[PDB]
Design a protein around this ligand. Structure first.
Ligand SMILES: [Mg+2]
Ligand SMILES: [Mg+2]
Lengths: 418, 418
């Protein structure tokens, strides 16, 4: 009913999710109790419409649509898996997954209809096949680089509970391990506390490398690599002090379930102070922002930024090069000892304009060469993608990530299973 | 209190606005009654918080913030003008306007503060000076091309009442006439019924040329020029028939005060069926969309498109080149007999990604050359602008159109008045 109960529930069913994913990727038995956890988590969100979590001072109405849909699709997926597992006990998990009709499960969620879902699915499948064919030509597996939010994961009203489902995790991990030599994930949010590593349900130390702050931080191999480059050592740590001055403010009753909800990015802090249209009062937001301004201790190398009506930022800087996802990709590839210039295909997935640099860099290195899949892109963005790349023919546009997921599952069913 | 009362009130005070603008641009006396109209229009919107207009079936809560701010700023501006007019009866209007401290009037509306407003103002002024200096170098006045919504005009919750204030109209007209040889306005919405020509408070047949449908239609000189290019004659007129099948649906009680609110664009119809977050019920929207689907009479060259959760489109096509604002600029300049290649500076103003083509085309013709001012642009968009153009130094970023307006007013005060 309250905030911490919701958060703890979601996080529990999420670590349970990771356990399930590990069990499905390492030929381990599927615990019916672990599934029961997700089942209870789903039943809890559907009883009292949406749900409203309250504390001892204020009350917030929270949109749990994404969490509910994720839990639902996961329940259907797992139910199927167990249904074929029971009928044939000692089959390998990929074979059982090859017998799952994921298409029928995901098609009912396409906002434009199943008919469009089918065509987008087929085109995405052929596109992906073109991407996979790179190995048979060059001898080495191609490189896959994607965005998270809106690209591989449906948009969530809260970043704090933007939890990745099981089927997508399994699909992405299998696809990355089987068909790619490099798979990278570039996000704007942090790695942890809460970050992409906490929201994901994937091996993390597997075939997929996760990043944060547009590539300024990475998780590999067992440690965290942070690229300051522009930010000073005093600009840094001061952000840490401010973060300490925020985490205790969250413990009072100011909340972090508003959009982004105070994120600690390598070079800045991004707090969500207001929700569209007007969740949370117009006054509490002002008290919030003023309290944030107070905890900025001159000045002291920390610059305040009102930014928008919904978000607010506290940045270090100013010496630097204005970091973007392109820099993250470049630095990663340079660090790994690989190259984008090497003859072979490159698949890049995105949903917003901030993903265009990733493409840019790629077509600067391999203009043969680059394949792009964009999710829910407006006309202008689609044209921009068509502009950065030559083709046109090398461009693929879908409406939702589930198209990509289903396509990948089909590719796995065809090439890894037969 | 109702819908039509609101619409008629706004339109009346808008034609009154045009009358006032004409009076201020042609050395005519300023009718105190015409000002009184705006005064009553302002008082009517501030009495009962926001306002809710209802009909005989449903009730809608309407955000009239933009209209109220426009009316308010207009009232202050006109009050000043009359205050110096009374103190010196037979002065020329530009001189009186040169004595108006518009900066103090507009600075209180900057969401980031007056301090930022000042710096953005100064930088924009110097930038504009650089733009004006082109005439003294090349002998001919430079070319100015801008976007409307979000660029020269604050965002409005309803396109039907997105009314341009007086001071901005005066400023833009004076600036365009005095410093430019070509001034163009590219919008996505139609020209009329309701269109940009109805929402503007500018001479229309003056120094500024207005367009619609990303340049597919233009108003010059006294007639409307429509570029089909891709759309067939049967694809056209069918859109007109559907439009006829919509305008009568609006007369029932389905409304067009939702965002865009059914727009007749040269190649398509863009209806606003849902508001963020959830103004209007979730069922009435469905009835709306289904009724729209019904009035599509095979099929019959009209393609339906769910697009987003808020908007919906009915497109003709498919043969064409996918028209953008760049094509509008190109076709306009080619039609007028001028050229972007000719040595001289080019100022381009925008707020979204759809304005990037305008820049693109320009830097394809004049890479010396192009100056860009972007309003309320996110980091990614700013970087994209910095990418399309070489400089960097030739880029100017502001937070609100009022910065541009105040800057232009200052330029007028310095060069046209002394
Ligand atoms: Mg993204
Ligand atoms: Mg615009």
């Amino acid at each position: 009913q309250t905030v911490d109960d919701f958060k703890n529930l979601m996080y529990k069913m999420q670590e349970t999710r990771r356990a399930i994913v590990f069990a499905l990727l390492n030929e381990k038995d599927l615990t019916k109790d672990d599934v029961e956890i997700l089942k209870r988590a789903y039943e809890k969100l559907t009883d009292n419409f949406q749900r409203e979590m309250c504390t001892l001072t204020t009350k917030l109405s929270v949109n749990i649509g994404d969490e509910t849909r994720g839990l639902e699709k996961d329940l259907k997926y797992l139910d199927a898996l167990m249904n074929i597992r029971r009928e044939e006990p000692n089959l390998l998990w990929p074979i059982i997954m090859s017998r799952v009709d994921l298409f029928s499960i995901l098609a009912n969620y396409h906002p434009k209809g199943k008919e469009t879902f089918l065509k987008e699915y087929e085109d995405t499948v052929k596109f992906l096949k073109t991407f996979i064919s790179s190995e048979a030509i060059t001898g080495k597996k191609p490189i896959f680089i994607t965005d998270w939010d809106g690209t591989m994961k449906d948009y969530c009203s809260q970043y704090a509970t933007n939890l990745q489902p099981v089927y997508s995790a399994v699909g992405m991990t299998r696809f990355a391990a089987s068909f790619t030599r490099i798979s990278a994930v570039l996000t704007a949010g942090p790695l942890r506390g809460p970050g992409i590593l906490d929201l994901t349900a994937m091996p993390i130390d597997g075939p997929v490398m996760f990043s944060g702050s547009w590539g300024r931080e990475w998780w590999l191999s067992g440690k965290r690599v942070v690229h300051q480059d522009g930010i000073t050592d005093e600009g840094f740590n001061a952000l840490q002090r401010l973060d300490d001055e925020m985490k205790d403010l969250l413990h009072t009753s100011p909340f972090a379930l508003v959009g982004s909800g105070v994120q600690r990015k390598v070079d800045r802090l991004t707090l969500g102070v207001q929700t569209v249209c007007h969740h949370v009062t117009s006054e509490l937001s002002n008290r919030y922002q003023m309290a944030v301004k107070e905890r900025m201790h001159n000045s002291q190398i920390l610059v305040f930024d009102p930014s928008t009506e919904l978000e607010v930022e506290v940045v270090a800087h100013n010496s630097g090069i204005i970091w973007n996802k392109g820099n993250g990709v470049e630095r990663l590839i340079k660090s790994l000892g690989d190259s984008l210039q090497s003859p072979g295909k490159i698949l890049i997935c995105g949903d917003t304009l901030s993903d265009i640099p990733m493409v840019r860099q790629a077509v600067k290195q391999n203009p043969d060469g680059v394949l792009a899949i964009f999710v829910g892109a407006k006309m202008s963005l689609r044209e921009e993608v068509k502009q950065v790349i030559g083709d046109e023919s090398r461009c693929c546009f879908v409406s939702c990530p589930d198209v990509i997921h289903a396509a990948m599952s089909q590719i796995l069913n065809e090439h890894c299973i037969g």
